[PDB]
């Protein structure tokens, strides 16, 4: 339930890969004035939840140029991760694009991308590796109380749980290997091999195998946001990848093998 305390309203979107649908909710939140960190394109803000509710007050309207399209939206939203993970009082992180080559579609793609990587994390863990991994939930929020931009586009953001500890990036989306840890690189290799080269998960970053904001490359280069560099991204990973003990333990081929022709 949404608290009566002072904060701003949002439409909250959760993607559920197993039913292949978005779940639409509302929430109230209070976000700090200044960001605590920044990346290339976005800034991160500390936020507290003032509760999660239904989307009943905020009708979608007609389905012509609705994103996501109505057929991708669950009619029912009684069950979801948000109602426990974003319950009243929860401290979490909000990310906003600075200064904006970001369509509406991009916010949803990026969050769906994180949910897909979250599935890959569970698949990896089922092999009983020495260190289990996990990707945080992420959500799209339409900050509906904020006045639209120069164009009548609502203000959009993504939100995710707060990581406590030293945040480290382990690889980039274009071949950088940034720490000496084995598990992040083995996981990237695992995703390439076990997907039959349909995709790779890189930008493996977070605190101690609790990861967030990954990026996927696919051979055809379609979908998965603007950070999908296609075969180029896959090949760049291969040039710098050196199999380690976790790769061996997972019985991964030391020969990675070529990209798919489109
Ligand atoms: N979920 C999160 N929890 C805490 N810090 C984060 C989170 N996501 C991103 N960051 C911070 O923002 C930076 C990204 O530029 C990271 O280096 C990290 O310091
Ligand atoms: Zn390897």
From Swiss-Prot:
Disulfide bonds: none
Binding site for ATP: 225-230
PTM entry text: The N-terminus is blocked.
Domain Alpha-type protein kinase: from-to ranges: 14-255
Stretches for region Catalytic: 2-262
Assembly: Oligomer.
Family: Belongs to the protein kinase superfamily. Alpha-type protein kinase family. ALPK subfamily.
Role: Catalyzes its autophosphorylation, which is needed for enzymatic activity and phosphorylates myosin II heavy chain at a threonine in the C-terminal tail region. This phosphorylation is critical for regulating the assembly and disassembly of myosin II filament, affecting myosin localization during an array of cellular contractile events, including cytokinesis and capping of cell surface receptors as well as chemotactic cell locomotion.
Name recorded for this polypeptide: Myosin heavy chain kinase A
Name of the gene this protein is made from: mhkA
